[PDB]
Design a protein around this ligand. Structure first.
Ligand SMILES: *[C@@H]1O[C@H](CO)[C@@H](O)[C@H](O)[C@H]1NC(C)=O
Ligand SMILES: *[C@@H]1O[C@H](CO)[C@@H](O)[C@H](O)[C@H]1NC(C)=O
Ligand SMILES: *[C@@H]1O[C@H](CO)[C@@H](O)[C@H](O)[C@H]1NC(C)=O
Ligand SMILES: *[C@@H]1O[C@H](CO)[C@@H](O)[C@H](O)[C@H]1NC(C)=O
Ligand SMILES: *[C@@H]1O[C@H](CO)[C@@H](O)[C@H](O)[C@H]1NC(C)=O
Lengths: 359, 359, 359, 359, 359
């Protein structure tokens, strides 16, 4: 019983199998269970709001036809070069750019057929998928990125898509992302589509990504803090009269503006204010207030110069103010900073915890 | 009544359907109604003057042929692999670069045919479209971007394009742009094309985009203002004789030139002057005038040095000028700035309001 | 008289039309008139010396065959899917990179055939074309960019290319370039090609582009001038003894070097010296000479310090020199700058005027 | 005995050779030996974690069919245009992006067939392969990059992949990399794949790459060291009272922050701390501690100013501290730096030596 | 004698011409002479070590078949659409990335056939070719870039490649490169390839490129020199006691480090030290030594301060040293620089002259 004779006999010009007609025509819709395996996730672009994923799509549906029932083995592994002579369902991705196939030495495709007629179609695909991420809290956030699968040409009374009950979404073992930590929530929902042409089936899968704060802390939170420390200690424990104290402030402001521009470099332009903007704005406000304080001290010194020639009675009165302000500044500034840091870190921790619970 | 027999019978070698001849040949022009659905707008490049759009083109026309009239159901959903055996009309985009199709698991295409002969052709297309935007007012403006559809090979007495009376342009729900706000004007006009070869049909669609000022305000209007504030308060409330006061001005000018270069970084080179250029030029003029004022004060001080050895009569005469100028400067500069800001913001608000009314 | 029968009958297996043999074989060369319409010019890259153009090529030639002479209408608009069964001439572009076609909903192609046999072939093409621009005068210049069309496979006694007598080159109405102004010279020449294999026909078209000076003036000529003004007025109207005067020069030099590097940023590396290099070099020379002058003043002051303890006789002798140099510098520097600006702007104006007359 | 007759006769419609059925069907799995030749390795991207390689894949397997046994010469070199009429095995790369073929003048392919039936299939391929490199030790490290080959459609009882016993991996003579030194370990392992669909064969090859420290040393280790040297010697051998000493520190800090940002520029964002970060952090700590020391000296000087009007008894007591600290600083700082450098270089040398031994 | 009948008759199903069998089968190897014309060289990337070239490949070989010998004209220009029905030889480029063809309006291809059977095959190709350039001497060097042509599928007793005796390599008239000057050496060698599969023919062509020093001199050699001049003259002709003199050095060092980083920006990372690195290192050493000298002068001044209250006997002794060092520095530094420049320019001139003679 040669393989070739049977092979053609099933889907040949002698067989009545038309590949342009859906199975069970004029009948109940063809149910399709979809299984996805993630081979290599990664390369998430924050600029143009998209990520790259290489999946192994797997879809099964039941055909009354192609149930040979005359062979010792129930499952037959067929050629992937005769995949044009069967009824593949139409499937497209809604948030999709590009999405090439792969042709290395052979087409990366798979066909299997059981005795009853259940088929197994497996396709390797790299997808560039659009994720409209919300950057309300930039360094610490959970981002949800969407994969949607729809039928382009078939209305709801044909080709209903369903998920797989067990192991709908899998991940390759030892798969890591440099920037994000993937979570195991693996949310799945059915989100039907309505158009003027008709109503079309859809199923979607949701992934939760948390952002590591390790890079961001080292890159920005540490340098900005160190420059605040530098300004604080450096000028106040210097003599009242000096060009250096003044110059220090200007240079510190220059560093702050360069770092502020540097932070908002990779990020796409957005209307709302991110957390990192709040932090850098507060640090800039601290150094600006510090330079203003020194300018005020200089004015008090100017008053002393005018007084110098009941002369000494006024002199000390102003000078003592000079000293009092200088000491209060020394003890006042760090405590206020400490207070800011605590009420900032606490609230952000509460927001991120609430966000993960909400999602 | 098997599907295959009829299916071929309509558009087969036994049928007299030639796909190279227009329907109703030697007759009135084939009218075509066009419906467009916008799946995902975005990614607008200001440099090379273009934007990206992913649409769902839909065009309907009437064929006397293909009106079977022998089936229980009026509408038949046919295969998208037999779309080469019918009379699709020619259609191209005038301001177009690229414009690939999509081939993911199947071609993303749709064919429908009613009992009378009205067809429905639906195509998924990503377009890179050229928009010749006018940057007269850079941060606040309304930009109109053009989509034009034309018949390449058919003159006006064939294949007249028309718009759809109801729901000509739709937008996918919850579609947002990071940089712009789309408006609901959805202007539609017919803009016929004349060539030496002949006169060709065209229809166009206009989109109005407003620019959010949230990013621009934070990125440039706030830092420049803060550096003006810094210069103003810092030097004048310092003693007349100091190297610091001089140095401050030079560094402030350095910041202004770097920010001015930074502003005109993404923008393409254009002859006309943008609003942001006016703002940065005025701020640069303020700090330049401030440094000139300090230089003049130094010259008055030089006069005092020459006088120092009717000697004291001249001395005070110049010194009082020194004081008078210093105080007037303190009160003079902010009010003039305030006046500038009001007459700048008011006029730009009037221009943008006029522009939206005009469009 | 059905369309299909005739349609095939002309260029069918029953017709003796071989599409691999040139018309009028063993005869006079096939003359071809070429008409070009420019749909969208632009995107000129100065780095890799090329520009992008989207044209509508149109070529006409006479075929003795395909002159049916039996139809009421002289001109027939045929399908663009049967363009493989005729004798298209070979045509390629010599300074060409890439040059894709366009396939949106249909091929963008056109076929027309008259009663005598004159055909009309219209093709939409985007060309990346190499322009070896000469940057001798960078901000103000006229650049000539070349389009060449040649026959790859046919020697001069076949397929002679000719231009069209009227309307050889057209431009779409309201077509503008952000950087350049297109001129209406529209030069056309025939520039035959000689090879060892044979002698091949060619025709070329020349476009003249002038550069707007509006962006360049604002970006570089104004900031550099303002920094020269700043240095000039700032240090000389300050007291002889100061750290500030010295520091000012160094910072001004830093600005000059950064701007000089910034100017030569987009530009490709070239051996010859551009006009902008001359301007920035002269401005750098002015500030360098200014700092040297201050250093000399300091040395004269050093002489006074040595003299201070016929002592006063020497003292004033040197001091008066100090004053004399300071005043002459004040009046000397701007006039010399003014002279430089006039003899620079005048000569460049003469060169550009001569260049346009020459071209 | 004409070539054509035999040529077709072997794999023709008269032959029973079906190219869709595996050789030795219903039998032991088809064993495949794989030989790889590396034509041009290189272009390793640290950002998106991948490298480029151009290989010569070679795979041999035994076919009972195609053993003609009637020719004088055992080995026949066949055409590479009839490679569609045989049973090529499926093969794909797991960590693969892209992987085009090459079509220059002909397809770059090879077919050979021996008398017994052993075939030789040779394919030229450029692979972009994903390497998840570990940057724990950035300048000095050994990186292992993975190539994996798998059967997409065939389970373990078909198409078992095996390596070649002799010369499995070769390298073209005189092949060098600008950044890395390739090692000759050439590790080979079999790393079978398990899926829910089935169990699939795989074989992998490991390459060891060491990083040259020549560029990194010159680019970063030398400038940072020179700036530490500059700060150290420059300020301490200057008078106690000066604006210059203060300013020096701020500028040195500015250089350190710019260099620190410059170092972490090419590198992708990662949570863990690299060796270069440790080095730059320690150098920044040294200059920060130096500026703090100067600030403390200024405070001691302030005490002297307060004392100046048992007055002189206190004065010297503080002044001597000033001198003592200044001298100890002079001798203290370099030795501590020397100690740091030795314990840093030694430990990194031990870690890299351990790593190469482990791998 | 119609063209079509003969045309097919030569290479038709009635002719015994099999296009899968080499001419003169079981015979001496098919000799192939190769002629290359360079249409447009250029776009040489120093980063990823490659260049772009657009060539006109021409190869001739002798076929016993296709020698009609019955026509008045010896040479026939055939269609380039029947190039699939002949025996083209296999040819690939070893150092090749990409290498597309060109399809503009027609395939850019040529076929000619003489009476004896000598064919002429002409192909237009753009090649991206890998050149492993040696950057030992960066601004002045001669670089040799390699083109290699090999037979992928045929061993040495078939398809031997040979060069053309006259005019093997040509260049289009008036072809210029912005960065390099092409030389006329046009070296040609045969460099056979050995593999385990077999021994394969190869022929190679060598191009010599010299680098213009005009851009590099202006961009780096002039600014660095000017900044050395600035430092030299500026500080030494200033009073011994000043904050300005100190600050000058730090700023000059900042310029040197920025320029040094700027130089090594386009260049790929390499272990060895380039000439430009030597030059910038020496200039940095000069300014570093200058600042150290000023620091030493300050220490001598400190000694004078300690002495000031046999007191005056010590005072002058140190002061005279101060003066002596200051003058020697003034005359010492430029001569040493002059010596460096001469022994640097001379040796590099000798090395480049030796290199061109060697090549
Ligand atoms: C597909 O699913 C629908 C709804 O679950 C059901 O009504 C229909 O019978 C199913 N089709 C089958 C089992 O063929
Ligand atoms: C198409 O529209 C034109 C103008 O509206 C009309 O004259 C013509 O009859 C229409 N064709 C039809 C209805 O087939
Ligand atoms: C084509 O032009 C040439 C030169 O103008 C002429 O000799 C020849 O007769 C022309 N061919 C025609 C008119 O068919
Ligand atoms: C292939 O290898 C397996 C295991 O080494 C062996 O059992 C089998 O017989 C081999 N197949 C052959 C030699 O055809
Ligand atoms: C090709 O060249 C080889 C060596 O030069 C020679 O032996 C052989 O006869 C040549 N083949 C011909 C002339 O057909």
């Amino acid at each position: 019983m040669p393989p070739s004779e049977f092979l053609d006999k099933l889907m040949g010009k002698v067989s009545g199998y038309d590949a342009r007609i859906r199975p069970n025509f004029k009948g109940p819709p063809v149910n399709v269970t979809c299984n996805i395996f993630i081979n290599s996730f990664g390369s998430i672009a924050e600029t143009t709001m998209d990520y790259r994923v290489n999946i192994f799509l797997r879809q099964q549906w039941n055909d009354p036809r192609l149930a040979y029932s005359e062979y010792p083995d129930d499952s037959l592994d067929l050629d992937p070069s005769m995949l044009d002579s069967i009824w593949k369902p139409d499937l497209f991705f809604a948030n999709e750019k590009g999405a090439n196939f792969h042709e290395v030495t052979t087409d990366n495709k798979l066909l299997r057929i059981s005795k009853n007629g259940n088929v197994l179609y497996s396709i390797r695909i790299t997808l560039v998928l659009a994720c409209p991420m919300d950057l309300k809290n930039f360094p610490m956030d959970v981002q949800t990125c969407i994969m949607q699968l729809e039928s382009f040409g078939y209305t709801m009374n044909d080709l209903i898509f369903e998920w797989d009950e067990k192991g709908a979404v899998q991940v390759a073992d030892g798969l890591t992302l440099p920037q994000f930590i993937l979570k195991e929530e693996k949310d799945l929902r059915y989100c039907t589509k309505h158009y003027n042409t008709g109503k079309f089936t859809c199923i979607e899968a949701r992934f939760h990504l948390e952002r590591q704060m390790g890079y961001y802390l080292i890159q920005m939170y540490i340098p900005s803090l160190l420059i605040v420390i530098l300004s604080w200690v450096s000028f106040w424990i210097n003599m009242d009269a000096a060009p250096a104290r003044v110059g220090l402030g200007i240079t510190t402001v220059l560093t702050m503006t360069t770092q502020s521009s540097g932070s908002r470099a990779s990020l796409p332009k957005v209307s709302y204010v991110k957390a990192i903007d709040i932090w850098m704005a507060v640090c800039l406000l601290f150094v600006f207030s510090a330079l203003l304080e020194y300018a005020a001290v200089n004015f008090i010194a100017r008053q002393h110069k005018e007084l110098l020639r009941t002369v000494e009675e006024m002199r000390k009165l102003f000078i003592s103010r000079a000293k009092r302000i200088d000491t209060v500044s020394r003890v006042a500034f760090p405590l206020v900073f400490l207070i800011f840091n605590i009420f900032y870190w606490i609230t952000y921790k509460i927001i991120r915890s609430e966000d993960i619970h909400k999602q």
